[PDB]
């Protein structure tokens, strides 16, 4: 194991990616809040930051509705032979009545 190299731990590589996304999101929320709160900023960039704040507070609602529609879309394509490949339908071994019906078909012709 000592002669073997060391490896990048993926389980912490994902966590400081999602956490960095959340930190950048919180910094952008606290940055588009300050751009409208002061009065020295121009109105062309005072209302634009307001709608950018509206669009940033509306993010997990968008995730909720987006998730909902995609869950229904995934339920459209569950067909019980994808998820259940060992489905037993029906079978019937050959009875004596089949051979009797065949012999009757050859006798009455």
């Amino acid at each position: 194991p000592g002669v073997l190299p060391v490896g990048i731990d993926t389980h912490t590589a994902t966590d400081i990616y999602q956490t960095l996304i959340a930190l950048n999101l919180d910094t952008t929320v606290n940055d588009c809040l300050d751009k409208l709160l002061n009065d020295e900023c121009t109105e062309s960039t005072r209302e634009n930051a307001l709608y950018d704040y509206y669009a940033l507070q509306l993010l997990p609602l968008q995730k909720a509705v987006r998730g909902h529609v995609l869950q229904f879309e995934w339920h459209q394509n569950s067909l019980l032979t994808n998820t259940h490949p060992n489905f037993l339908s029906k079978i019937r071994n050959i009875n004596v009545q089949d051979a009797l019906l065949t012999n009757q078909l050859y006798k009455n012709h």
């Binding site: 809040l33 409208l36 709160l37 307001l50 704040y53």
Partner: peptide, 15 residues
């Protein structure tokens, strides 16, 4: 409660 913030609190959330 300050009037610099009262005009913006109902602006950021209309509820």
């Amino acid at each position: 409660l300050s009037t610099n913030l009262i005009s913006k609190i109902s602006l950021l959330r209309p509820s």
